[PDB]
Symmetry: C2
Subunit: 67 residues, 2 copies
């Protein structure tokens, strides 16, 4: 599954404890091509995610070197 | 529940068939205070919905008419 992300915004940073676990929830909206990552009801990541219908390998050719 | 909407956008109009039914699916993102109604995987309404924490009846007073 090639994928394309867009307008990713990181609202906060989740600190992993030494002992114990932290749960993250991902909710998708296929109709709106959106997504959402949450931790105890607090938005932690937002943006747009959808499948790349027509991949183009040309996109991965190395660009002209700045120097 | 005193609710507050914001940035409601109607995308396509749903025609109600004379004979049959149309299924509207409503998904919420409580973390982002956002909602999206969909019809057969197509977006119909997008916006924000959230509970009105502090209702103020003064908001419903009738503004003085310009005429």
């Amino acid at each position: 599954l090639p994928v394309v992300f867009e307008d990713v915004v990181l609202h906060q940073a989740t600190i992993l404890p030494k002992t114990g676990t932290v749960s993250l929830e991902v909710r998708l909206l296929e109709a709106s091509r959106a997504f959402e990552v949450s931790e105890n009801g607090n938005l932690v990541v937002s943006g747009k995610v959808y499948q790349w219908d027509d991949p183009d390998p040309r996109l991965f050719d190395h660009p002209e070197s700045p120097t």
